[model samples]
Target: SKTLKEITDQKNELKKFFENFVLNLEKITDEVLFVGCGSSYNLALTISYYFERVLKIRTKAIPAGEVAFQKIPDLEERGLAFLFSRTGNTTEVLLANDVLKKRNHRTIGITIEEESRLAKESDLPLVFPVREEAIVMTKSFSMILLSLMFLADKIAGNSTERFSELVGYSPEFFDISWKVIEKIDLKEHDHFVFLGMSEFFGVSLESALKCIEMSLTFSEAYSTLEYRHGPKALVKKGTLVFMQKVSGMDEQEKRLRKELESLGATVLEVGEGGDIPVSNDWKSAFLRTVPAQILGYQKAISRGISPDKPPHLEKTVVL
Candidate 1:
């Protein structure tokens, strides 16, 4: 039950976890399955995208609960199964791990605890002990993300020097994000929409969930161009549209942004060349998530709510 400040102050501890986890990346298989729930599920989706884009590996993200109850033929073919659980004791994830173990599949558990069921069950468990606390996952999320980014880079065998430099810049990115969050006005709009393309779609999903969990606000997320297909009808004067632009989609994203703005929707751009400046490299997509996380914390604080203990959310979802 540490506060956001307390968790953010433990950046060095999280960095250590990242380094250790990355060093063990060679154990993963060509095809991987990621399992989680809620915010953890969103994180899985983001990691899946990273694995595909950076490593050229086929990866899929599935909710652990669903996989446990249903017979997924895909699981039978997977060389590796990566299970993510904040508490490492989620009932569905544990059940899925049991299934994978019974099939003699190589399993790895990434979790906050080494004593939990997931860690105890996996063939090789990568425990991130530094993330053992903090209810809303302020540090845990970043740690897992950094670990995954490193793994993907190692597997791809490209740009090790650039990847190392990017890792070094993480603390500074987090610092700048905190400052950006402090200046934003969360109450300026009643409804919010998060838009991202490619890998950033996962970020959009996470950002929307943060708003819902922290402030009890309903938020929607969509792909940058997909929003124009039908969802644009919902844009109005009091709606807030948050866009995360990707490379090669500037013209299309700009069109959507201008369209939403003309409809009187408050357009807040979060990545490179918009309202908030961000890194342009695709490898730095995870860094952009730092700003969204900080904004979620700030919005919760503005609403006089505890970011560390959002109403109906738990540090580790057991179900």
Candidate 2:
């Protein structure tokens, strides 16, 4: 097995790393700013929204490169700067942290690398030992998201007991998920669109990115309701739509899936009452991403592409 193939073998290992250090989660004032690059940026989107939607806090996520130019309002150096980097040496994340620090904002970093620049630069860095040993994140992502979710629970005065009680990742879950993902015909679809709402929207975005980055597919993401606005026009016989279903929006999501199928597209739904079962809990985001990872891996293999080493991408973007 290669790097990605090995890193993804036992994805449930993330649960083993979530204990002890997740305690005594730090706090922020009004808002939290999340910044990262590539997969880390997408992960940040899920965290920032988890804070906003789950905790009712004011938070926003921005690509590290984007902040290098157009400064956002909340980033005026006030709240908390939540920076993430798997390698902990991403130039953009480091730059974003530098800007925020000069503005007198408190910077916190989350990364798997303990001595990486990110850990050194942050005021309070949460370092994990679960290294991926692959260019792409894999378990690093699931664990990082798990850590932030617990932090969010702590910050919101919510009981960490719920997160603590449950198993972090499920082996039985992925065993079934891979069976379904592997059954999909790789050549049937030319376009893939991943859809979800709120934090799941970030899930959808990251899902699409995995395809584009590893499989070299044309992939896009949208909020389930927002897809009807214009993006639905892309649907056709060769399209595959993946939806990260939300709890209360069953009717809306159901109608959209039906419409896409009617237009000759194939729809795969996960969460609530769909083809696969998923939960709306913040932790479920990690579970929800499994299919995308497997799909991208299989699709790339079927296409004679190397998903472990995506073309024109580096593990760390240095300026």
Candidate 3:
């Protein structure tokens, strides 16, 4: 129930963040790099898409381990780096921060710990401490994301009306997501795939991870059109695909849905007129994860697994 509560209560969290938190960076470089591990890495991928779209900044998200153990991206300028960790002390993220600093890039640490190593080491640490007790992150993911989006909008001189709109609509969003999850029988499917385009691709990835973590289900994520390339062969009678349909791609979404349905896979197309009626946009990314989180919770419970105590997981992943 803590997981569900955290999932549903994110709207209020966003409202507080929007009302109070301010990004206090002196300068944002032309290019931005995001680095994290696990769910934070997925959030990095999603935020990179959002930053590029709104601020027109060249952005890329890399696993912290890649930047730590391997090579940092070559950029003309010292791109600003955002290091993400719910624990604020993920080893690779801190290592990546050290690596970026050595490269003359400024690092902004984003995390939920006030006294974390990332907080002490970062050039500009931004902490959004939470009381989340669930082993698997729920609200912290969206809270950190929208907080960054709020900053991005401010830097771009763009109106944050959409953020407020999401805050207002979150109750309805949770209700609709739960209703959708309730309709699907847990025993009906064993394989899951999450599909989306643009920023939603990151959403798809996180959704797939949720299925794997919470329900112990077989899950994967792909770009919407990319499914046809090779992944469609994996589709079968027991597969359930959740596709977040982007606006202006109605024809593509419809065609893909038809194809998957014909392959005997039940596709839950989410968009304006799909199985889920949420609108598609950067803001929709915040709302879209709700269904997947709830579904993961429901599936875990159905299988007699405790969603809160996911096996072999910790509140914070650390070495």
Please tell me which predicted candidate would have the highest TM-score against the true structure. 3
Evaluate residue 195 in candidate 3 and report its C-alpha lDDT on the 0 to 100 scale.
Answer: 93
lDDT of 1 by residue, 144-205 (tens): 77677777787678765555566667777667667755665677766878898767888888
Residue 252, candidate 2: C-alpha displacement in angstroms: 1.7
Q: Model 3, range 131-238, lDDT digits (tens) per residue?
A: 676777788887778778777888889887777777667777777778887888778888999999878999999999888889899999999999999999988898
Q: Rate the local accuracy (lDDT) of all candidates.
A: 0.73, 0.77, 0.83
Per-candidate total of colliding backbone pairs: 0, 0, 0
lDDT of 3 at 95: 87
Q: Candidate 1 regions off by >4 Å?
A: 1-3, 6-27, 71-78
Error of 3 at 237 (Å): 1.7
* Candidate 2 lDDT tens digits, 1-319: 3645543544545455655445544634677788888888889998888888767878889998776554665455477878988889998888888877887779888788888999999888977767577766666676677778887777677877766544433566566668877778888877989998878888888889888877889999988888889888878898988899876878888898898899988899987588777565656876677777777888888899888878888888896
Q: Judged by lDDT against the true structure, how good is candidate 1? A: 0.73
Whose TM-score is higher: candidate 2's or candidate 3's? 3
Ranking by lDDT: 3, 2, 1
Q: Lowest lDDT 10-mer window, candidate 1?
A: 6-15
